[PDB]
From a paper:
In contrast, RR inhibits TRPV6 by binding in the middle of the ion channel’s selectivity filter and plugging its pore like a bottle cork. Compared with the open-state structure, the structure solved in the presence of RR showed a distinct non-protein density in the middle of the ion channel pore that perfectly matched the shape of RR. High-resolution reconstruction of TRPV6RR allows precise placement of the inhibitor inside the ion channel pore. On the extracellular side, the RR-binding site is flanked by aspartates D542 with a spherical density on the top that might represent a calcium ion typically bound at D542 in the absence of RR. The surface of the selectivity filter is highly electronegative, creating a favorable environment for the positively charged RR that carries a 6+ total charge. Correspondingly, S6 in TRPV6RR and TRPV6Eco was entirely α-helical, typical for the closed conformation of TRPV6. This interaction causes repulsion of the lower portion of S6 away from RR, which results in partial S6 rotation and helps S6 to become completely α-helical, with side chains of L574 and M578 sealing the pore.
TRPV6 is a calcium-selective ion channel implicated in epithelial Ca2+ uptake. The channel is assembled of four subunits and contains two main components: a TMD with a central ion channel pore and an intracellular skirt that is mostly built of ankyrin repeat domains connected to each other by three-stranded β-sheets, N-terminal helices, and C-terminal hooks. The TMD is composed of six transmembrane helices S1–S6 and a re-entrant pore loop (P-loop) between S5 and S6.
Numbering used by the authors:
A (entry chain D), B (entry chain C): 27 to 635
């Protein structure tokens, strides 16, 4: 907060550092006559700095003043070069300011006195960060491209500029147009600026030059959701084979869209980026067909063979828990509240029959399966993000967490079976619930179950969790009242609130109306019970019918319009994942390779519409 | 009703008092020739009054008649001055009527005979009240401004008018334009009328002059929801620091918008006014940023430290009720329906162990907390509205009532503990429910829980209370039938309706289907039970599914479009409250103060867009 407070103070401190001098006053407004009196009488020094360490020329450019600064140059011609020596607008010179305010006559007077066009505004007000409402780059070519000024673009190339110049982020000027809020004007700048390569000794095209994330402008249009620069960039990568009346056969280049090894690709970048406007690109004319190609041919068959193996694995795990080793209890019961008949066997006792060795096969299969789950999910964070970049992906998939939590609870049950620890029902019951509810992951490989299963996630991490805080508040208040109302009664005749953890659990069940809840009719209940439970029942059904509301504004007004789009993005995230963690010989590469067609070492996709 | 009946009779009695005289007849229509016969033959008196005590001239102005009234002035020149001597349009003269009907030639003939322009229509038809469909003021400048007549505005300033003149409410003419139903025409009158200050010896600007509620025109635009006069008035309070291409840095005056001590402010006026169109102003360009400033920096941290203290306080209170002093009962049970095992200890017995003194700390903390709740909420009605202005604020907050009802029930439990009164479970159970459901107040300081918690209030004081009247009717009829059906049976085999208060409570539970309800299958139930309960079950599920309807027209068609707006208004109401009841040294004032920037003793807000 203090940096935005410091930035708010520097703009006000700038407006005060003008008013206490005449030499910086005649170069703010159009008062040229006093400035001729300021120079010849006392012969004062003219390099007086303002708040940002700048000369009076930067105030002239920021308010469009040309006339007094001529006498500044007939007397002190060296004024052109000196940039801002500040720390917020650092390295910004007078040329940058006249570019974004689009002054043209100042360029003809500066450059006649050998001005500078390769200056780099590296200050913090020009960087790519959400505090700054503009991002233009660092160079004066970059600024004129972004305020949509064709004249200043050609006026710099005449004066020794450079279009292959980059930011500290590595963005060239072609990258920066893709980042602009005004999309259609960026398309015209892109065609204007790309048309100045004109050098064969240099090998790199300007639209192939990557920034420091290794992204081209084409891939930067994909990551940012710039769909009209995506379609515009796609004509460099089309080829029209033939036109047959209403038909045409278009061949798509597919080189930077599909994966080519260790280099990151457009399909994987759209999924693994934090931006949501990138998912509109997943419906475009080389990409929508590419995704439907590899899902219908290789993705969906493998995802169904993976879900048929997983289903048999959990059915095998379920039988090992149903047949877990149990024996009659040894000590006698300690109290009439003791319900236990059976306890689990020791390791020396639990494998002593042919019926046990059928279970040992399934137990070893279960253990082997949990290790293979931890060998393909846990080694993919130590080269990846340890808890950060894996932690970002959790909103895309909770089933990563669920299948590791399953495999954790299997191996805890293994350890407790090895050391004869008591309480194997605790890790098993988590594992039965975790392992079976992971079958819902494979719902995304079906037309019927895919868009319904996404609705489940967005209501548990939205409106269900939202309801649970308000539910916990009501439960805690009424369970405490129900506890102290029945605290003086006999629990043998009404035991719902006999101690305080049972009173919490009973009130929870009463909230959901899943237990019938306290009545005897042979005995006098306290009168406060009938008052409190009537009030509880009105509030609980009010709240329950309110959760039913919020789940209907959640779906039909937020996530029913995007059922297919969120589900098609799940097919892409699955198909990308199911190719990276699968061998090369099982997965043919998508598209048709050249070198048998005179097309190169490229893989091409044909679309006939 | 009788005053609107009296007002309806006076307009009809006015239409009859014309027809019985010739001297008031020739001055209604264009019959000038008979009027020259009415004057010279019998030489009659001309000051004959109508129904509102008015002369015949007011009938001429009300129907645009100029020609006969000239001979009225060549014979009786003193006719100009005499106002209405009525009590509904009191003090209205002929100049007011010709202004609102926009006659111009009558002004040139009256004022040539020294007419009056400082007349005050103080009658009841011109006051600000919902019976009157216009509110124009009292002065003839005020009327011409409101019917949008620029010519008559300049025609009065030439004739000795006064723009600094006020109503009996204290509204100047600039106040009255803000109150008009035609917003855009009021903006042009505002620029026309403000441009006539032109006096340096007088100190007060016309747009700074307050009415009797101490409100400027700027604050009157805030209170009334006049958003286009709010934005128009805001340009007097902006200052553009610089423009950098697409960027500009605007500095907002923020003096009459933020609080300056005991004088009432714009943020607190929007919240504490009864009007709902004022909440649109809470989204405007100096106000939306000011609110998000002090909530994100000071409001939200303090509201979370206040909710973390309150949560620990209620957890401490909950433990004191769970560990309340109880002993085995002394007398024997009086009947087999007596379920009580325990009774509470006396004061001499309830503090006799180290386990009691841990509870005495928590009980004293609970008591001290309830006094501090009553010291910051109850002394704020005796200088405020005792039950009226506090009573108006209840629709904004029920948690005022809930936290005082909590603190009332704590101290009743204190008194009953001090005097060994029996029945402490009655004030405690209210206090556990009231104290825990007050945690839902702190839901408004979160993005997730804020708009959901407002939905709860608007359905309990709307559709739930609406359903409860219809529910009580059905419950009362069927409980009485269920009572008399089972009135001849043995309640040992079916006890749901054994007496009439249990029959009411059972039918309530049966309505909500939260108890399973009567079946035995070993015994013959009355045949009327199966008829009545089938009819009850159809009606109860019909009604329950109808409550589910009404809660979906309530939200998605009334209060889902305004979830963020009702929740942002709750942030303003919380931030205003949490600054007034909090010290000065903990709360830095919002904005940047001048006097180190040449800007005055004002606090300014900078907005860069
Ligand atoms: C996203 C989902 C939301 C989850 C919310 C979390 C809710 C879940 C919380 C669960 C807490 C469960 C533990 C309580 C019981 C422990 C067992 C025990 O022995 O206690 C004992 C008493 O102990 C107490 O009195 C503790 C209760 C005090 C108030 C609890 C509030 C704190 C929870 C923080 C929640 C704040 C969150 C509010 C949210 C805004 C029981 O007594 P006894 O042994 O039976 O008899 C004593 C005998 N004698 C008295 C006759 C001598
Ligand atoms: C979401 C909506 C929330 C609603 C909030 C709920 C409102 C809550 C307000 C409750 C106020 C009730 C006062 C309680 C104080 C009783 C003290 C007393 O002396 O009583 C005595 C008689 O008891 C009776 O016979 C009277 C029963 C209570 C009165 C009617 C309450 C029903 C509310 C109807 C209107 C409903 C309107 C609601 C509209 C919706 C009991 O004393 P005792 O016999 O000596 O005890 C010994 C027996 N023992 C040993 C077994 C212990
Ligand atoms: C916003 C929320 C809505 C709230 C609505 C309020 C509803 C809540 C109302 C609650 C009233 C509760 C009190 C009744 C029972 C008292 C106990 C008692 O002793 O009574 C006794 C009889 O007494 C009666 O018969 C009274 C019943 C007559 C009709 C009740 C309607 C009046 C309620 C006004 C409602 C109109 C509102 C309608 C709305 C349009 C019980 O008899 P017994 O002792 O068991 O046995 C006698 C023995 N013997 C016969 C064999 C000899
Ligand atoms: C929201 C919708 C609301 C619906 C309104 C509900 C309609 C209400 C209309 C009800 C009309 C019923 C007539 C009641 C009079 C009976 C008198 C008699 O003599 O019967 C005798 C035989 O009893 C029987 O065996 C016949 C049972 C009733 C007939 C069929 C009723 C079911 C309705 C089907 C159609 C449903 C259509 C509904 C469509 C929806 C009983 O006399 P007893 O044996 O001598 O008694 C001694 C036993 N005791 C000592 C134990 C006491
Ligand atoms: C997709 C849906 C269809 C799929 C088809 C399968 C689903 C449904 C199939 C069968 C279910 C119905 C048959 C009941 C089971 C009885 C088996 C038995 O003989 O019990 C024996 C022990 O039992 C065990 O030891 C098995 C425990 C787990 C082993 C898991 C299989 C391992 C084999 C390798 C597989 C590798 C896994 C592959 C890895 C990827 C003997 O005990 P008993 O005392 O004689 O008990 C019978 C008497 N009683 C009941 C009266 C007490
Ligand atoms: C949340 C609750 C539910 C969770 C899901 C339950 C978990 C278990 C989930 C899925 C279990 C398996 C489902 C059976 C196959 C489905 C039928 C089908 O669509 O065809 C599939 C065939 O796929 C295969 O050929 C292999 C399927 C598994 C082999 C074992 C689709 O593949 P294809 O593209 O049509 O291939 C054409 C084959 N051809 C080339 C020979 C022409
Ligand atoms: C936010 C969520 C986390 C917060 C953490 C806290 C939440 C959870 C924390 C603890 C809950 C779980 C522990 C159980 C409680 C046992 C304590 C005990 O020793 O009992 C004793 C008496 O007990 C009392 O006297 C306490 C009664 C209320 C005192 C309130 C605290 C005052 C201390 C100052 C605080 C100032 C408050 C601050 C003001 C703003 C001994 O009785 P006993 O007979 O030996 O009982 C045990 C045997 N039995 C059960 C088998 C019968
Ligand atoms: C209806 C059921 C639910 C009802 C609610 C349950 C009742 C309990 C409710 C809230 C309980 C407390 C919640 C923990 C804090 C929340 C985290 C957070 O958002 O940061 C908060 C930090 O606020 C603080 O720094 C102090 C918070 C409490 C301290 C004790 C927000 O403040 P900030 O603006 O981000 O401050 C930045 C700090 N910095 C300047 C150091 C950088
Ligand atoms: C003795 C043998 C035959 C045991 C059988 C083992 C298989 C049933 C297990 C072993 C490893 C498992 C895989 C390990 C990890 C994953 C990643 C997992 O990814 C997610 O959960 C994605 C998260 C999301 O996006 O929601 C999908 C299932 C899969 C392929 C698992 C499918 C089931 C496998 C093949
Ligand atoms: C032994 C008992 C107490 C188990 C309790 C453990 C819970 C923490 C588990 C049980 C089932 C789990 C759920 C089962 C299924 C899913 C998958 C997923 O839900 C979806 O809708 C899938 C996401 C998608 O479709 O993209 C998000 C997590 C969730 C709700 C799980 C969250 C964790 C849960 C609630
Ligand atoms: C509000 C939403 C988000 C769900 C939270 C509801 C809570 C009130 C639930 C969640 C877990 C429940 C607990 C889960 C396990 C148990 C153990 C259970 O049995 C025992 O403690 C041991 C057996 C005995 O001696 O009775 C008693 C209830 C209790 C504390 C439950 C009390 C009610 C709890 C706290
Ligand atoms: C021994 C000590 C530490 C006991 C602890 C005392 C606090 C937990 C209490 C004492 C006074 C209470 C305050 C008294 C009154 C109010 C006003 C209250 O305002 C409303 O209820 C607004 C109503 C609405 O608009 O809905 C908000 C909570 C607050 C600050 C209370 C918060 C909790 C406080 C600080
Ligand atoms: C022992 C029993 C019989 C007590 C009788 C009634 C109680 C259950 C009290 C304590 C909790 C109270 C509720 C707690 C929260 C609120 C605040 C408010 O609800 C909201 O949605 C908050 C307002 C907002 O968000 O602006 C309206 C009153 C209400 C429902 C209260 C109404 C009265 C209640 C139900
Ligand atoms: C219609 C909506 C708005 C709620 C109102 C429903 C009523 C039918 C409820 C509200 C309060 C209830 C009462 C709350 C307290 C009691 C005390 C309860 O126990 C006793 O009277 C003492 C013990 C005994 O001797 O049985 C019997 C039911 C009764 C009258 C309840 C009967 C049903 C009532 C009137
Ligand atoms: Ca039941």
């Amino acid at each position: 907060e203090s940096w935005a407070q410091s930035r708010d103070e520097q703009n006000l401190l700038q407006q005060k550092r003008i008013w206490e001098s005449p030499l910086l006053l005649a170069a703010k407004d159009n008062d040229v006559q006093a400035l001729n009196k300021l120079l010849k009488y006392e012969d004062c020094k003219v390099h007086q700095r303002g708040a940002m360490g700048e000369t009076a020329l930067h105030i002239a450019a920021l308010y469009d003043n040309l006339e007094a600064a001529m006498v500044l140059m007939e007397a002190a011609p060296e004024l052109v070069f000196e940039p801002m020596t500040s720390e917020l607008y650092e390295g910004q010179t007078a040329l940058h300011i006249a570019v974004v305010n689009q002054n043209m006559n100042l360029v003809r007077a500066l450059l006649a006195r050998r001005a500078s066009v390769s200056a780099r505004a590296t200050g913090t007000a020009f960087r790519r960060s959400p505090c700054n409402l503009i991002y233009f780059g660092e160079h004066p070519l970059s600024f004129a491209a972004c305020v949509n000024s064709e004249e200043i673009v050609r006026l710099l190339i005449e004066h020794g500029a450079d279009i292959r110049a980059q930011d500290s982020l590595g963005n060239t000027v072609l990258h920066i147009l893709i980042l602009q809020p005004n999309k259609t004007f960026a398309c015209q700048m892109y065609n204007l600026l790309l048309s100045y390569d004109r050098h064969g000794d240099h090998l790199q095209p300007l639209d192939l030059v990557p920034n420091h994330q290794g992204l081209t402008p084409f891939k930067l249009a994909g990551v940012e959701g710039n769909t009209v620069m995506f379609q515009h960039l796609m004509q460099k990568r089309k080829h029209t084979q033939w036109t047959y009346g209403p038909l045409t056969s278009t061949l798509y280049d597919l080189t930077e869209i599909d994966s080519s090894g260790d280099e990151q690709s457009l399909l994987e970048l759209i999924i693994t980026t934090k931006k949501r406007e990138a998912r509109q690109i997943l419906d475009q004319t080389p990409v929508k067909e590419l995704v439907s190609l590899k899902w219908k041919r290789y993705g969906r068959p493998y995802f169904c063979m993976l879900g048929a193996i997983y289903l048999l694995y959990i059915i095998c795990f379920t039988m090992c828990c149903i047949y877990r080793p149990l024996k009659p209890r040894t000590n006698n019961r300690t109290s009439p509240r003791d319900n236990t008949l059976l306890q689990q066997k020791l390791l020396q006792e639990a494998y002593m029959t042919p019926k046990d060795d059928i279970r040992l096969v399934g137990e070893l299969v279960t253990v082997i399966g949990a290790i293979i789950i931890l060998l393909v999910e846990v080694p993919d964070i130590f080269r990846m993000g340890v808890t950060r970049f894996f932690g970002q992906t959790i909103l895309g998939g909770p089933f990563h967490v669920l299948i590791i939590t399953y495999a954790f609870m299997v191996l805890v049950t293994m350890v407790m079976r090895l050391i004869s620890a008591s309480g194997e029902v605790v890790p098993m019951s988590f594992a039965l619930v975790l392992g079976w509810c992971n079958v819902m992951y494979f719902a995304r490989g079906f037309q019927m179950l895919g868009p319904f299963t996404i609705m489940i996630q967005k209501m548990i991490f939205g409106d269900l969790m939202r309801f649970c805080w308000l539910m916990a508040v009501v439960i805690l208040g009424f369970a405490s009242a129900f506890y102290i109302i029945f605290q003086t009664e006999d629990p043998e005749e009404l035991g719902h609130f006999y101690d305080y953890p049972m009173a919490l659990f009973s009130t929870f069940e009463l909230f959901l109306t899943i237990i019938d809840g306290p009545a005897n009719y042979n005995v006098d209940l306290p009168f406060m019970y009938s008052i409190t439970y009537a009030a509880f029942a009105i509030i609980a059904t009010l709240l329950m019918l309110n959760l039913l509301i919020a789940m209907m504004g959640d779906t039909h007004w937020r996530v029913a319009h995007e059922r297919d789009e969120l589900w098609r993005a799940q097919i892409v995230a699955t198909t990308v994942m199911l190719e990276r963690k699968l061998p090369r010989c099982l997965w043919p590469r998508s598209g048709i390779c050249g070198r048998e067609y005179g097309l190169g070492d490229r893989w091409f996709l044909r679309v006939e519409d």
